[PDB]
Each structure stands twice: as structure tokens, then as C-alpha cells.
Design a protein around this ligand. Structure first.
Ligand SMILES: CCCCCCCCCCCCO[C@@H]1O[C@H](CO)[C@@H](O[C@H]2O[C@H](CO)[C@@H](O)[C@H](O)[C@H]2O)[C@H](O)[C@H]1O
Ligand SMILES: CCCCCCCCCCCCO[C@@H]1O[C@H](CO)[C@@H](O[C@H]2O[C@H](CO)[C@@H](O)[C@H](O)[C@H]2O)[C@H](O)[C@H]1O
Ligand SMILES: CCCCCCCCCCCCO[C@@H]1O[C@H](CO)[C@@H](O[C@H]2O[C@H](CO)[C@@H](O)[C@H](O)[C@H]2O)[C@H](O)[C@H]1O
Lengths: 49, 240, 179
């Protein structure tokens, strides 16, 4: 496998460019927030008398 | 169902063209078996990935037939080419044939998914319509590659009538004789001319550039739309 | 809209990028993919020629069957140069020879897939009645694209190759290799 790519440097490069392009597109789509949702969920019943 | 019927037909029309070039029932029965194997495979995938049988998936199958039959044709044709260049038994030929095109086949399945997969990434309303084709077609051609180096070579190994060195079929009497004798001769003129046009280079670059021009033109003038308005055999009248 | 429309131009950009990249890896070159990428317009010219002729629109159905034509065109291109390249590497043949020998080996299978597919979608372009609109759109585009892809390419691919080999040769060409 490394010997594979020691002979195929372009193929080596290519895989890199794809992974990068992929990440590039990821950076655009991805949400941005402070923390992930890490509080637990809650439900509240409200009544009035 | 009307689309379904077209699959069935296109398969039948394919099997006729095959008979023409391939000259023998068992040979042309090979790409004929491949196509529905894959198509049926794709219905399996769709179901897994949770899609449904809809107008776009159906056309997806339809369009898939081109990609499918080409994988099959490419494989069968190669073996047959080998058998005539180097006079070899079936099992031998396919065995060396598959060695010679296996790489290209898996390579191409990737290059192609590059042209179909991005479709799966349109956003909103527009997206889901295009996504259907994208998965279908991509799925269908994965199965196609898989099938082309699992089943096609097996069939190609067993079912192919052995062809002798130089037997290009020019010799057999009847219509198949003419077609083969014509194709052989036609082939030569094809390289005789390509031999010729290659000598120039220049004249054809502009020719190409013209095409690029025209394409750009015809494209910018041609209108756009989403989906056609089908005759549903029903309609409304409103009264105010 | 609303909420952003027109995203395709951007996707066909990464698409046209990833396609070169893969082909670059396939041929172990940056220069050879071009002699495959250049066949793209040879089928679009016919898809367009047809949809206008027959008075169609650039609709979802026209687009998808366009790609299908782009794919098959590309595939046949890919296999021709793959065959030409592997004839100046495994054997030791010249540019013109490697090209010629490849392109005749590849002619039968291409006519084979073209006729079978064009003929195969004929039911669509001829279709009337229910779902017709769809069937006609899909079928007309592909039909035209496949005709012009076939006829144009097989006289254009041989050129693309020998031209890009020559703009990117490194003085080790051209005569005849050995061994
Ligand atoms: C062979 C090569 C590739 C081409 C094959 C593609 C086939 C396309 C089929 C889509 C047609 C739509 O209709 C589809 O047909 C099947 C089978 O009759 C129906 O199946 C129905 O009939 C049977 C009766 O025995 C019931 O058991 C079943 O519960 C019921 O759903 C489906 O309700 C429907 O989804
Ligand atoms: C998202 C992460 C990144 C993943 C992306 C993967 C990249 C895929 C792009 C195209 C793949 C090309 O496909 C592959 O190309 C090489 C090119 O040397 C071919 O390799 C073939 O030719 C060479 C020599 O010319 C042989 O030594 C080799 O053993 C043979 O298989 C393979 O037959 C083919 O399978
Ligand atoms: C080598 C890789 C292969 C890729 C090459 C690509 C060349 C052509 C292939 C497909 C044709 C492009 O198709 C393109 O799609 C978009 C989106 O639906 C269209 O866009 C149009 O319709 C849609 C939907 O109503 C809207 O998003 C948009 O506002 C409008 O301009 C373009 O007008 C059309 O030209």
C-alpha cells in the first residue's frame, strides 16, 4: 500500500485533494454553536387555579 | 406501469441489437441476463435505503439500462475480440480478458459516480426529485460493476462459442455474412480516415471550438422548467 | 426560492473537479484526463439539438438523461485512451500507432452500446398517452445526445489524445518505444 503510492504519487495526491474538497464543502454546510446540545430535555405542565 | 413496459421493451430491443453483432443466441443472452439482474438488484437497494417506486426512480432504471448494458457489452465484446486475435478457448480468453479490463471497470464506476452523486445534493424540493435519480443510478451501476466481475465472466467463460484465429465471421453465408463482411470493411475505412484526420490536428480544433460555440448558444437560448404538466385525465372548473 | 435557488452551477463545478481528479489518478497524469473531459460537449450538442428541434424545455428529465449521455460518452473516451496508453506502456508502440490500434479495437463495442441504447429508448421518444410528457422529455434528450456522442466522439477522441500527448510530451516521444 505505501509501496503502491510510492509509485503512484498522483493517486496519492488525488485522494488528498478529494478529502480536502470534501472537508471544504463540509465547513460551509456545518452548524456553528458554543456547545453541542448537552443539557437534558424537559417538559413542563402548567396549570392555573 | 407505462414506464415499466418501456423497460421490458428496451431490454427486448437491446437483445435484438446484440443478436446482430454477437451473431449467436447464447452470446447475446449474456448482456440480456445482466441487465435485469442489476435492475432487480437496484430495487433491493432502493428498498434498503428507504426509497420508493416512483416516476423518477423508474426512469432511473430506464436510464440505468445504458450504463448496465455497456458494462456487459464491454466484457463480452473483449473476450470475443481476444478469441479472434489470439485463437483461445472460452475459459482462457475471459480469464485473460477480465484481467485486462477489471481495473478500468472499477475505475470508471468511480469517475461516473462523480457525475451522478453530486445530484443527490440539491437543496429543498428541487433536491429530493434529483436525489431519486442519483441514488438509483449510482446504486444500479455499483451492482453493474459487481455483476460484471462475478457473473458476466462466469457466463462468458461457460456460454461463449469458441472463435478461431481470424474467424471474424466474414465467411458464413447469409445476412450475417454480409453484415460481418461490411463491418470489417467499414472498420478499416474508420481507421483509414482517423489515420488521415490525425495528420492535420489543426482543422479539427476549430471544428471542436465551433461545437463548443454552438452548444453554448443552443443552451443559453433553450428555456427551462421543472417538471412537465402531464395530462392526468382529470381537471377542475372553479366558479365565482 | 426562498431560501436560495440555483445551486447546480456550483455542484457541477466540484463535479467537474472530482471527475478530473479521479481520471488523473486513473491515468497517473494531470495531462491525460483532458483527452476524456473534452468529449463532454460532443453529446450535449445533440441533446440540445433535439430538445430545441422537438420544442422541449431544460427540465429535470432533460438534465438527468443529459448526464447519462455524458457518462457513456466519458466511459467510451476513458476506455479508448486506456487502450491507447496501455499500448505505449505494456507493448512499446508510438503515439499514432497506439491511438489507431486502440480506436479500432474500441469501435465495435461503442457502436454496439450506442445502437442498442438509442434503439432502446426509441419507445420513449415515440411514446404517446399516459406519462407521455415525461417519457418524451427523457427519451428525446438521450436519443439526440447518444447520436452525436457516438458520431462526433469516435473522430474526436483519437484527436484529443494525440493532441494532449503532444502538448505534454517531455522529449521521450514519439517515434517508437522499446522496451
Ligand atoms: C424484470 C426486470 C426489471 C423490471 C421490474 C420492475 C417492476 C416494477 C413494478 C411496479 C408496479 C407497481 O405495482 C406493484 O406491483 C406489485 C406486484 O403485482 C404489487 O403487489 C400487490 O399484489 C400481490 C398479489 O399477489 C400482493 O401480494 C401484494 O401484497 C400487493 O402489494 C404492488 O402493490 C405494487 O407495488
Ligand atoms: C473520499 C476518499 C478518497 C477516495 C477516492 C478514490 C479514488 C478513485 C479515483 C479513480 C480510481 C482509479 O482506479 C484505479 O486506477 C489505477 C491506476 O494506476 C489502476 O491500476 C491499474 O494500472 C496500473 C498500471 O498502469 C497497475 O499497476 C495496477 O495494478 C492496475 O490495477 C486500477 O486498475 C484502477 O482501479
Ligand atoms: C463532466 C461532468 C458532467 C456535468 C456537466 C454539466 C452540463 C449540463 C448538465 C445538466 C444541465 C444543467 O441544468 C441546470 O440545472 C438548474 C437547476 O434545475 C437550472 O436552473 C433553473 O431551474 C431551476 C428550477 O426551476 C432553478 O433552480 C433555477 O432558478 C433555474 O435557473 C439550470 O437552468 C440548468 O441549466
Amino acid at each position: 500500500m505505501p509501496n503502491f503510492f510510492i509509485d503512484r504519487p498522483i493517486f496519492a495526491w488525488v485522494i488528498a485533494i478529494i478529502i480536502m474538497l470534501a472537508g471544504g464543502l463540509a465547513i460551509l454546510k456545518l452548524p456553528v454553536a458554543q456547545y453541542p446540545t448537552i443539557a437534558p430535555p424537559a417538559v413542563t405542565i402548567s396549570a392555573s387555579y | 406501469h407505462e414506464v415499466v413496459k418501456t423497460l421490458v421493451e428496451a431490454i427486448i430491443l437491446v437483445f435484438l441489437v446484440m443478436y446482430l453483432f454477437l451473431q449467436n443466441f447464447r452470446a447475446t443472452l449474456i448482456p440480456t441476463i445482466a441487465v435485469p439482474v442489476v435492475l432487480l438488484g437496484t430495487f433491493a437497494v432502493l428498498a434498503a435505503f428507504g426509497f420508493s417506486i416512483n416516476t423518477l426512480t423508474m426512469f432511473g432504471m430506464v436510464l440505468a439500462i445504458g450504463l448496465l448494458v455497456d458494462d456487459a457489452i464491454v466484457v463480452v465484446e473483449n473476450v470475443e475480440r481476444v478469441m479472434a486475435e489470439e485463437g483461445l478457448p472460452p475459459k482462457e480468453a475471459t480469464r485473460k480478458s477480465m484481467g485486462q479490463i477489471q481495473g478500468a471497470l472499477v475505475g470508471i464506476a468511480m469517475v461516473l459516480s462523480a457525475v451522478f452523486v453530486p445530484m443527490a445534493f440539491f437543496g429543498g424540493s428541487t433536491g429530493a426529485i434529483y436525489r431519486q435519480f442519483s441514488i438509483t443510478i449510482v446504486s444500479a451501476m455499483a451492482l453493474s460493476v459487481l455483476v460484471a466481475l462475478i457473473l458476466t465472466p462466469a457466463l462468458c467463460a461457460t456460454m461463449l462459442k469458441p472463435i478461431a484465429k481470424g474467424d471474424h465471421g466474414e465467411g458464413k453465408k447469409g445476412f450475417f455474412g454480409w453484415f460481418n463482411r461490411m463491418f470489417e470493411k467499414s472498420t478499416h475505412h474508420y481507421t483509414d480516415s482517423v489515420g488521415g484526420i490525425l495528420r492535420s490536428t489543426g482543422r479539427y480544433l476549430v471544428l471542436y471550438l465551433i461545437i463548443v460555440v454552438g452548444m453554448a448558444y443552443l443552451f443559453v437560448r433553450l428555456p427551462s422548467s421543472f417538471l412537465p404538466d402531464e395530462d392526468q385525465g382529470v381537471f377542475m372548473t372553479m366558479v365565482q | 426560492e426562498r431560501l436560495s435557488g440555483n445551486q447546480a452551477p456550483s455542484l457541477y463545478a466540484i463535479s467537474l473537479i472530482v471527475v478530473f481528479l479521479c481520471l488523473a489518478a486513473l491515468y497517473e497524469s494531470w495531462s491525460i484526463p483532458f483527452s476524456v473531459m473534452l468529449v463532454v460537449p460532443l453529446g450535449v450538442i445533440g441533446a440540445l439539438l433535439a430538445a430545441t428541434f422537438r420544442g422541449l424545455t431544460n427540465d429535470v428529465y432533460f438534465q438527468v438523461g443529459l448526464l447519462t449521455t455524458i457518462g457513456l460518452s466519458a466511459k467510451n473516451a476513458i476506455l479508448i485512451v486506456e487502450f491507447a496508453k496501455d499500448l505505449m506502456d505494456k507493448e512499446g508502440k508510438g503515439l499514432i500507432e497506439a491511438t489507431l490500434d486502440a480506436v479500432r479495437m474500441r469501435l465495435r463495442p461503442i457502436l454496439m452500446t450506442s445502437l442498442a441504447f438509442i434503439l432502446g429508448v426509441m419507445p420513449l421518444v415515440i411514446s404517446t398517452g399516459a406519462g407521455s410528457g415525461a417519457q418524451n422529455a427523457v427519451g428525446t434528450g438521450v436519443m439526440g445526445g447518444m447520436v452525436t456522442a457516438t458520431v462526433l466522439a469516435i473522430f474526436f477522441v483519437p484527436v484529443f489524445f494525440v493532441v494532449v500527448r503532444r502538448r505534454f510530451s517531455r522529449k521521450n516521444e514519439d517515434i517508437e518505444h522499446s522496451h
